[PDB]
Amino acid sequence: YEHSTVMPNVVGFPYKAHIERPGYSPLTLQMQVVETSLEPTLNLEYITCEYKTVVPSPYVKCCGASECSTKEKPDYQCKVYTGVYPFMWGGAYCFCDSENTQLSEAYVDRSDVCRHDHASAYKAHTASLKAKVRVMYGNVNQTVDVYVNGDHAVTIGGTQFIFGPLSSAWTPFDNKIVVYKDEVFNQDFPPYGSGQPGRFGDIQSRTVESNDLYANTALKLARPSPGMVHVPYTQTPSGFKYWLKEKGTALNTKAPFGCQIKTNPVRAMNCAVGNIPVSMNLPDSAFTRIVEAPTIIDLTCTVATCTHSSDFGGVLTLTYKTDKNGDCSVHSHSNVATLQEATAKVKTAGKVTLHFSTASASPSFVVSLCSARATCSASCEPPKDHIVPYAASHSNVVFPDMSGTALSWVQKISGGLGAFAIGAILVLVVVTCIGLRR
């Protein structure tokens, strides 16, 4: 028996579906979303880590000269000075007083611990939703892992379940992403090969193990002081170490809809948005023939107490007359009130109790026990607690019924005004007819 439904994408909300086969007693399912996971698709752009400047020892040439040699090193620098007269602890070598040269050399390189501490720059698009649902009906429990898209069928006790694509297409990750350890940032990073010194991305590597490196950190050599051997240099500080202390905010403490961001793999979890269509296919063994089900007649519904609070703040009583004692399925056909239980024990005593949760001043809904029906109306008083540590258990519907107190007053006033207008129109029509018949 094929069936379909639409259920909210809220974690912990006890959705109940009612299936009415005409040759069998009604059946009630319960589906709950234990966990979700919004998995995006990532493409690595480059990898940034702190750099490490390498300064080889100077080559002081005594009584001669040396020439600069170019090399293919990241941000390589080389210069030759003239007129150096160095000194050491024992004395001063380079016997020639003035005709000596010193060759300074330096270049940048990736750090030693870059494999353990680096920031990745990604591109995020086309998120894929994956969920873990709990399905319980009849006497079968289970929890399953289902991809939320129209092409994954999972069977739970002979029933084939297909969870349709999510209603919305909203993702909390922008096009460009920077990932560091366990934090995700919505950042716009410079393109590869065009990084600026002192800021994020001064040195960039295509991959952790990639040999190629692009470095732009304004390394500049200076002339050594007289009578010294030190190879002076200057360089703008690391851009990664600066970005560490001035990155600002995150996405963990910034994401909308109250969903946590994690890493490895990057994903946003338990993130309440949209609706999830569901398609089923049940075998004949799930239902019970109508002859076995108890026969219920003369169903009347009364409400003892009501309080439109987050938890189940209502009590329901049903009176009936039965021939045998068995099991019925209880369902509410409107989303203004949600029943706590899905089955009840019908007995010859003719009285059962139910719990429901509502969020309107005056609810009106029809409840069914096995095959019977009954219309319930009640007056609910507001609660007293200001704040509670648990989520809402109702569908958040506030508009009262047309038979409520406020709507009754509105109806009475509008009826009086309409009666006055009708009398006015009748008098005017009578006068016009009398005038025209003259």
Ligand X SMILES: *[C@@H]1O[C@H](CO)[C@@H](O[C@@H]2O[C@H](CO)[C@@H](O[C@@H]3O[C@H](CO)[C@@H](O)[C@H](O)[C@@H]3O)[C@H](O)[C@H]2NC(C)=O)[C@H](O)[C@H]1NC(C)=O
**Which stretches of the chain bind ligand X, using CB under 6 A?**
62-64, 95-96, 99, 136, 141
Q: Which of 319, 393, 325 is nearest to 355 (CA)?
A: 393
Among 20, 63, 65, 125, binds a copy of itself (CB under 8 A): 125
User: Pairing state of beta strands 343-346 and 59-61?
Assistant: unpaired
Question: Closest approach of Cβ 125 to a copy of itself, in Å?
Answer: 6
- CA distances to 10, 53, 109, 218 from 75, rounded to whole Å, are 53, 10, 9, 8
CB of 153 to a copy of itself, least distance (A): 4
**Structural tokens at position 146:** 């289902």
Task: Find the shortest distance in angstroms from Cβ 190 to a copy of itself.
Answer: 8
The answer to whether residues 102 and 59 touch, using CB atoms and an 8 Å cutoff, is yes
Contact characters 174-203, a copy of itself, x per CB under 8 A: -----------------xxxx---------
Kindly give, in sequence order, each residue whose CB lies less than 8 Å from that of residue 130, ignoring residues fewer than 6 positions away: 36, 37, 39, 145, 146, 147, 148
- Give me the 144-163 binding string for a copy of itself, x by CB under 8 A, dash otherwise: ------xxxxxx----x-x-
Least distance between a copy of itself and beta carbon 113 (Å) = 28
State the binding partner of 125 from a copy of itself, ligand X, none, CB within 5 to 8 A by kind.
a copy of itself
128 binds a copy of itself (CB under 8 A): yes
283 is an interface residue for a copy of itself by CB under 8 A:
no
Report the partner that residue 412 touches, choosing among ligand X, a copy of itself, none (CB closer than 5 to 8 A by kind): none
Q: Is 425 helix (H, G, I), strand (E, B) or coil?
A: helix
Name which of 35 and 39 has its Cβ closer to ligand X: 35
Nearest distance from C-beta of residue 150 to a copy of itself, angstroms = 7
Q: Position 141: which residue type?
A: N
What are the residues whose beta carbons fall under 8 Å from the beta carbon of 366, sequence distance 6 or more?
A: 332, 333, 334, 373, 374, 375, 376
- The rounded distance, in Å, linking the Cα atoms of 304 and 277 is 36
- Residue 128 or residue 141: which is nearer to a copy of itself going by CB? 128
Q: Which residues bind a copy of itself (CB under 8 A)?
A: 41, 43, 45, 125-126, 128, 150-155, 160, 162, 191-194
